[PDB]
Paper text:
Human neutrophil elastase (HNE; EC 3.4.21.37) is a member of the chymotrypsin-like family of serine proteases and is stored in the azurophil granules in the neutrophil cytoplasm. An imbalance in elastase activity might contribute to the onset and progression of many inflammatory diseases with an impact on organ tissue integrity, especially in cardiopulmonary diseases, such as chronic obstructive pulmonary disease (COPD), bronchiectasis (BE), pulmonary arterial hypertension (PAH), and pulmonary fibrosis.
In our complete series of co-crystallization structures we observed an induced-fit binding mode. All bound inhibitors from the dihydropyrimidinone series were characterized by rotational dihedral angles of the northern cyanophenyl moiety of ∼90°–135° with a preference of dihedral angles of ∼110° (mean: 111.6°). This position projected into the solvent and accordingly was not likely to compromise the binding mode; instead, it was well suited to introduce a large rotational barrier at the C4=C1′ axis. Indeed, with a sulfone group, potency could again be advanced by a factor of ten (22→28). For a better understanding of the binding mode with our novel conformationally locked systems, 28 was co-crystallized with HNE, which revealed a binding mode nearly identical to that of ligand 19. The N3=C4=C1′=C2′ dihedral angle of 109.5° was very close to the assumed optimum of 110°. The sulfone moiety pointed outward from the active site while one of its oxygen atoms was hydrogen bonded to a water molecule, gaining further binding energy.
Numbering used by the authors: 16 to 36, 38 to 66, 68 to 94, 96 to 152, 154 to 170, 172, 181 to 192, 194 to 209, ...
Write the structure that this text describes.
Amino acid sequence: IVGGRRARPHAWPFMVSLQLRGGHFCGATLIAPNFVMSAAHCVANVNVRAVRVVLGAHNLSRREPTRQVFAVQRIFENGYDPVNLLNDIVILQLNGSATINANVQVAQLPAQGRRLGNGVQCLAMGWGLLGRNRGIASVLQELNVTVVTSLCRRSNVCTLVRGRQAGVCFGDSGSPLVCNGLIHGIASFVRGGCASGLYPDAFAPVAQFVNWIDSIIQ
Ligand SMILES: *[C@@H]1O[C@H](CO[C@@H]2O[C@@H](C)[C@@H](O)[C@@H](O)[C@@H]2O)[C@@H](O[C@@H]2O[C@H](CO)[C@@H](O)[C@H](O)[C@H]2NC(C)=O)[C@H](O)[C@H]1NC(C)=O
Ligand SMILES: CC1=C(C#N)[C@@H](c2ccc(C#N)cc2S(C)(=O)=O)NC(=O)N1c1cccc(C(F)(F)F)c1
Ligand SMILES: *[C@@H]1O[C@H](CO[C@@H]2O[C@@H](C)[C@@H](O)[C@@H](O)[C@@H]2O)[C@@H](O)[C@H](O)[C@H]1NC(C)=O
């Protein structure tokens, strides 16, 4: 996240860190005790048997007793088409269920088909890069963005921070975009690189996929 701030610890208890060989590589969102969702680009060429799904995290450079760690039992995909920037969404089935508590909670989703208009206020977040020469988050970052339709396909929800250079970056892939308390996005791609100040950021449009998500989580 470029131009963000620290989340208060555990403010977003559905936020997930996907890790390999102890390193964070993408965000995800807890959508049932035993399912997460993320971006398909996050898992395309990954070794999934080795992915660790880390719930209840805040500061990744710390040992944190609030964490719960799962493996991926299987993945569900839905026609990911990267060249056309379509269906950038995967669900990972965990090898058990999370214990729900203060730090680990299942997110809420919009209705199938809900579109958000221009100007809707949302929050992005993640443990990605902080931008050119400013390192990487330890602590989960968050960022106020605004929904925009200009320079955005209908197959995305796009957001923009007007008047300053801010947005999602590498490592924020797969993280939720929360709008009116619901997960309307999954961080998918950037245009003009991170925080161009020119092009909106693009998220996989979760509301286009709720039927598919429900078909898996019930
Ligand atoms: C910046 O964002 C916060 C949080 O946004 C709200 O909560 C997110 C998780 C998501 O649901 C967003 O769509 C929501 O907008 C804003 O805080 C809200 O501010 C209003 C009063 O302005 C208040 O009644 C709410 O309780 C606040 N919600 C929370 C969780 O704090 C904040 O206003 C945004 N700021 C700007 C300048 O855009
Ligand atoms: C991490 C990343 C890529 C990969 N792999 C890549 C990409 C992302 C999504 C999609 C789709 N749909 C396709 C690609 S690509 C370049 O075809 O492989 N393009 C892209 O911009 N990024 C990327 C970089 C910075 C932030 C983000 C995100 F998700 F946070 F928005 C994504
Ligand atoms: C579920 O998986 C947990 C984590 O397994 C560990 O991480 C995976 C990715 C591999 O790296 C593996 O070697 C590790 O064991 C376990 O600690 C946990 O008990 C498992 N839960 C089950 C089977 O219910």
